[PDB]
Amino acid sequence: EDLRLHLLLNTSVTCNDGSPAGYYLKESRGSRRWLLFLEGGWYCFNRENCDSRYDTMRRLMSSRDWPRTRTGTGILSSQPEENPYWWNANMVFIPYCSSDVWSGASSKSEKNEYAFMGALIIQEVVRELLGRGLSGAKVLLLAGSSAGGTGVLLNVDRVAEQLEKLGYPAIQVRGLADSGWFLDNKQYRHPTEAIRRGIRYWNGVVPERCRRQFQEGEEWNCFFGYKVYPTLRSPVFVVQWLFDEAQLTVDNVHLPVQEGLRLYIQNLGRELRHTLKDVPASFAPACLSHEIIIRSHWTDVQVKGTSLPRALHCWDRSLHPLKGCPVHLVDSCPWPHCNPSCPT
Ligand SMILES: O=c1[nH]nc2ccc(Sc3ccccc3Cl)nn12
Ligand SMILES: *[C@@H]1O[C@H](CO)[C@@H](O)[C@H](O)[C@H]1NC(C)=O
Numbered sequence: 001e002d003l004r005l006h007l008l009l010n011t012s013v014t015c016n017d018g019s020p021a022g023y024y025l026k027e028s029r030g031s032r033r034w035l036l037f038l039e040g041g042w043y044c045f046n047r048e049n050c051d052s053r054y055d056t057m058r059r060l061m062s063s064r065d066w067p068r069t070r071t072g073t074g075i076l077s078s079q080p081e082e083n084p085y086w087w088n089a090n091m092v093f094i095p096y097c098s099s100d101v102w103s104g105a106s107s108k109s110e111k112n113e114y115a116f117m118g119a120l121i122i123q124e125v126v127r128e129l130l131g132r133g134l135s136g137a138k139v140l141l142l143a144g145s146s147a148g149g150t151g152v153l154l155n156v157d158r159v160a161e162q163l164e165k166l167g168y169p170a171i172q173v174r175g176l177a178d179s180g181w182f183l184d185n186k187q188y189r190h191p192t193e194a195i196r197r198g199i200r201y202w203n204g205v206v207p208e209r210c211r212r213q214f215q216e217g218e219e220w221n222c223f224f225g226y227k228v229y230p231t232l233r234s235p236v237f238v239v240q241w242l243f244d245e246a247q248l249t250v251d252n253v254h255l256p257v258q259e260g261l262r263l264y265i266q267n268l269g270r271e272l273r274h275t276l277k278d279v280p281a282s283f284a285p286a287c288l289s290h291e292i293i294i295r296s297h298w299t300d301v302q303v304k305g306t307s308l309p310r311a312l313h314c315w316d317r318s319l320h321p322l323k324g325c326p327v328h329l330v331d332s333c334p335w336p337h338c339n340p341s342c343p344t
Contacts (some may be wrong), residue, residue, distance in 0.1 A: 001069035001070065001071055001073070001247065002026045002069070002070075002071060002072050002078060003024035003025055003026045003069060003070045003072050003076070003091055003092075003093055004024060004025055004026070004068065004069055005022055005023075005024050005066060005067070005068050005069065005070075005122040006022055006023055006024075006025055006128075007020040007021070007022040007063060007159075008020050008022055008048075008121075008124050008125070008128065009019050009113050009128055010124055010128075012107070012276050013100060013117055013120050013121055013124040014081065014107070014108065014115045014119075015061060015063050015097035015115070016050065016061035016062065016097060016098060016099055016114040016116070016256065016330055017056070017064075017108070017114065017115075018108045018115055019062045019063045019064050019087070019097075019312055020063055021063060021097055021098070021117065021121045021124070021125075022095065023067070023089070023092050023093065023094045023095070023125045023129075024069070024070045024091075024092065024093040024094075024095070024311060025090075025129075025132070026072060026078065026090070026091040027044065027090055027132070027133060027135070027189065028078070028088050028089055028090045028091070031088050031090055032136060032137050032138040032139070033086055033088070033089035033090065033137070033138070033139050033141070034089065034090045034092065034129070034137045034140045034141065034240055035075065035076065035086055035089045035090065035091055035092060035141045035143060035242055036092040036122075036126070036129075036140065036141070036142050036143065037051065037075070037076055037091075037092065037094060037096060037111075037143045037144060037145075037148070037293075038094050038096065038102055038122070038142070038145075038147075038148030038149075038151040038152060039091050039093065039094065039096035039144070039145070039153075040096060040097050040144065040145045040146025040147040040148040040149065040151075040179070040180070040186060040291070041057070041060045041137060041147055041339040042099075042146075042147060043065070043099050043100060043147060043194075043198060044099045045194050045195075045197045045198035045201055045202075046197065046201060046324055047113055047114075048113055048268075050099060050113070050237075053099060054156075059095075059097070060096055060097055060099060061097055061099055061114075061198045062097060062312050063095070063097060064140075065300050066095065067287070070093055072091050072093070073165075073295065073296050074292075074298040074301045075143065075176075075293040075294060075296050075298065076091050076093060076294055077296070081129050082296055083309070084299060084301070084307075084309040084310070084313070085308075085309040085312045085313055086312075087223075088123075089141075089298060090133065090134075090137075090170060092125070092129065094121065094122065095132065095261070096147060096148060096151075097121075098116050098117050098118035098121060099114070099116065099334065100116040100117075100118040100198065100202040100204060101147045101150050101151060101154070101195070101198070101199075101204075101223060102117055102118035102121075102144075102147065102148065102150070102151025102153050102155055103116075103118055103121060103151070103199065103202060103204035103206065103223075104116025104117050104118045104120075104202035104204055104205075104207055105117060105120050105202075105204075105205050106117050106202055106203035108343075110134070110237070114161055114202070116202035116203065116204070118151065118202075119154070119155060119158070119204075121203050122142075122151070122155050122158075122159065123158065123162055124158070124312060124328050125220055126140075126159055126162060126163070127162070127166070127324070129325075130168070131164070131289050133315075135168060136169050136199035138170070138171065138209050139171070139172045139174060139177075139316075140163070140171050140172070140173050140174070141174050142155065142156050142159055142173065142175050142176070143172070143176035143178065143222035143293060144176070144177065144178065144180065145178040145179050145180070145291045145292070145293055146178075146179050146180060146246065146280055146290070147173060147180065147293060148178075149177040149178045149180020149181065150177070150180035150182070150223055150225070151175040151180070151322065152175045152180065152236070153175065153180065153207075153228050153232065153236065153286075153340070154205075154206060154207060154222070154223070154228070155224055155235055156173060156174070156175035156232060156234045157173075157207050157208075157232055157310075158207070159173050160173035160234050161227065161240070162232070163177050168304075170295065171235050172319070174230070174234055174235045174236070174237075174319070175234055175235070175236035175237070176237045176239070176293065176312070177236060177238050177239060177240075177263070178236070178239040178240075178291060178293045179224065179239065179241065179246070179247060179290060179291045179292065180262065181225035181238055181242075181275070181276075182223075182224060182246075182247055182250070182326050183224070183226070183247065183268070183269065183271055183275070184224050184271070185215075185251065185271060186251045186265050187251045187252045188202065188229070188251050188261065189243065189254050190252070191250050191253070192220055192268050195220040195223050196220045199219055199220060204219070204245030206219045206222035206223070206228070206310055207222060207228060207231060207232065209231040209232075210222035210227070210228045210231040210257055213231065220227075225240075227255075228274035228329065229279065230278075235258055235281065235315075235319060236281070237281040237282065237311075237312065237315050237327075238276065238281065238282040238284075239271070239282070239283045239284070239292055239293065240282070241274045241284070241285060241287050241289045241290065241292075241306065242268075242269040242273065242285065242287070242330075242331060243265065243268065243269055243286065243287060243288040243289075243336045244288045244289070244290055245288060245290040245340045246290055247268070247288060248268075248288075250315065251264075251268070253265070255288070265335070265336070266334050266335065269334055269335070270334070272284065273280050273331075273332065274332055276330050278282050279328070280327060280328050280341075281315045281318070281327045282327075282328055282329065283303060283308050283330075284303070284310050284329070284338050285301050285303050285331050285341070285342060286330060286332075286333050286334070286335065286336065286337070286338050286339045286342070287301070287322060287336060287337055287339060287342035287343065288336035288342070289342065289343050293308075294309060297343070300341060300343070301339075301341045301342065301343065302330075302341045303329035303330070303331055303339065304329055305324070305328055306329055310325070311326065311327055311329055313325070313328045314326060315327045316333055320336050
């Protein structure tokens with residue numbers, strides 16, 4: 001319970017239901033490293049599916065029932081045995097309560113049942129943290145899992161742009177996108193369309209260079225990592241299971257596998273591996289799983305003999321190739337769990 005809740009002092013930056021958004025914070029005085037983690041949890045794209053989400057997933061739409069504390073786990077742990085990478089950093093967990101893949105900039109109003117303010121929540125958290133020690137940071141790592149991982153890709157350059165405009169050009173803004181690198185591929189049996197409808201429903205915003213490439217009506221393209229990543233200026237480390245369970249879910253794959261499905265699964269991993277070929281900081285194990293960075297046993301998986309905490313440390317060193325300390329770690333074996341270190 002080591003991170004303490006702070007609801008946003010600007011109570012107009014709200015969760016879906018108009019309750020104030022917030023963040024959980026554990027300060028580490030003397031550390032100039034700040035980790036801001038974006039929670040995931042899918043999204044909702046119209047009044048009717050948002051109403052259903054409000055009935056049975058309300059913590060993802062409201063702060064009314066949030067606990068006063070949370071325990072930092074995985075990359076958010078302050079214990080060096082659990083977090084070899086950044087155990088001494090200032091830890092921030094930003095709850096996902098906007099249902100908009102962290103892209104929205106719309107308030108609840110006469111015409112809007114729900115507020116979708118994910119992009120503004122991030123910017124307000126950053127602004128309020130500056131008075132709490134973030135002004136002295138040397139590195140701000142914006143991390144996230146699942147919808148939060150996509151949120152990193154959508155927001156990392158805006159955070160960098162915010163800090164420059166606020167007069168803090170010495171803070172190095174970086175991104176860590178976990179399990180948010182998806183493919184707009186063909187389903188195995190019969191997301192782009194839901195993201196398309198969602199952006200309109202949310203007033204969703206995408207990075208500016210990506211917006212300018214794809215232009216009006218096509219901003220949904222920027223929710224897909226392989227399309228938005230090349231447009232980003234901030235350093236971004238991409239973590240993605242080659243056979244992500246959420247990718248298979250949207251592909252209508254549910255796991256004695258016959259030839260058609262075997263070929264589909266192998267092609268997906270290849271598509272995967274191909275989109276990461278030009279991503280120099282990446283960690284992509286050949287496993288059927290979902291998320292990594294805030295799991296307590298995130299240290300266990302290895303690609304080519306290197307763990308993710310090591311790869312992230314090598315990435316830090318690279319931002320000061322390195323002998324025995326690699327940053328590009330993508331499995332080449334073609335089937336789930338061909339890497340023996342995959343989670344059970
Ligand atoms: O939070 C979780 N867990 N698994 C998933 C899968 C997709 C999403 S949103 C999304 C993001 C980028 C592209 C397409 C979509 Cl649809 N969020 N999510
Ligand atoms: C509160 O947040 C809203 C939305 O970002 C912004 O328009 C407003 O100016 C903020 N208020 C203050 C006092 O910063």
